Amino acid sequence: KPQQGGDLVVGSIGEPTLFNSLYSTDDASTDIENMLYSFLTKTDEKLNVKLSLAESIKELDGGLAYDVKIKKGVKFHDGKELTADDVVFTYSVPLSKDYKGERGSTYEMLKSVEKKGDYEVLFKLKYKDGNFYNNALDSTAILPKHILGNVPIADLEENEFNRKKPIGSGPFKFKEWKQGQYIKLEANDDYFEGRPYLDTVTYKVIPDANAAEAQLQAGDINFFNVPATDYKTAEKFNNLKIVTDLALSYVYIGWNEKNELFKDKKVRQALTTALDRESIVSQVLDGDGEVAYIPESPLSWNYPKDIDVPKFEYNEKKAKQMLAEAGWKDTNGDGILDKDGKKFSFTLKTNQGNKVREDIAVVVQEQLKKIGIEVKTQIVEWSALVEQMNPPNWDFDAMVMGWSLSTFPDQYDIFHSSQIKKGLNYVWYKNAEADKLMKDAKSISDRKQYSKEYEQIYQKIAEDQPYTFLYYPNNHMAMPENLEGYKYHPKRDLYNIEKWWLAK
């Protein structure tokens, strides 16, 4: 039944930065990595962990060690055999004092990684942490030691390997990256699970959602996440079908607490209270999506079904009062709030090509103007904005942004204060009581006990409003009407693309 052949052209509004899971922080990079490389495990469309490169994984010492046997006969794109050496190399990099990436959180539970045979590795942990089995194993792309094994770890991120000479063992091989235009990949004929059916996959960079929709209509791209507002338009396009479901994601406003304006919890609570988030969803998403009050996706087994968290529902006069109570009032008749010789004025950034977020930024500007807060909007190209938000820059006052969430629910990576300096706590949030809860939660094995203790963490994050949570988005995936073998995955848009085929 399955038929070999064809070319998929995937439209993307964001350009990748590099292809290396130890350094990338963004979904566009991750999309390409998942085609180029292999991983010990893979989380499937039901969010279950499955073996991929691993032949077997045995949990030892109550979760303080993992003995991993690797499939034999797996080749890198250069024809060389993947072995334990490569796995030991790759997972040892973030344990080096010279590691300069933002992914330290994923590996900090590791004490060591040891070769036990040509195809066998033992992982040893310093303490129990479910992030290792459930996140590190499926997130860590295996790199070739015979290429990178002697590059100084301080210089690994800059290496040309990560941009235009990547060599992996994944289902597609790198052909070309025409900067600002596209990345072209070709089926790996020697892929360990069998060659892809598709001959090529092209990731076409179009930082303008309207332009991408027009290209989809014309047949210049044939796979795209259509904005909800364009659904009724796109469903009429020739030769296409659309698969729709909830994304493992939320969209938010990040308030940078490096900025004086956003250090006070009461001010952050006021900003949320000033925003008509239901109207945002109605207006900007045409009602397609739900307002978010919790830093977790409804898809998660950890999502709290029966929790009453503070919501900070829209109330313009209450926001005014809260800001006055916090010391802000217009003291110069200019219409904008004033405190200690400073005016409440800042820049709200978001990413070029996401018309929904661009619109949200304008709506936030208008709604906050009504309570005397001045916002300048700024649209920035995706790769640059990723660079700006990350350490060592944190170069934003506020941003409209999203997370593609981890499939293993743990807020430590994003909200623990230890993750500010070199991790994903871009907004400089610190609640010492929340820190303790998140740290202590790692040792809780039973899921019911874990979820129960997480109710307290959600309460603290909700109360503190380090973000204004905006909504849980839906994906609307347009694809060729004859595309077979596709399964909807809420996190990986191109999940198992090597198994998709075009019926002819």
Partner: peptide, 9 residues
Amino acid sequence: VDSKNTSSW
């Protein structure tokens, strides 16, 4: 799999 900044939605 771990958290990533997402461009879409």
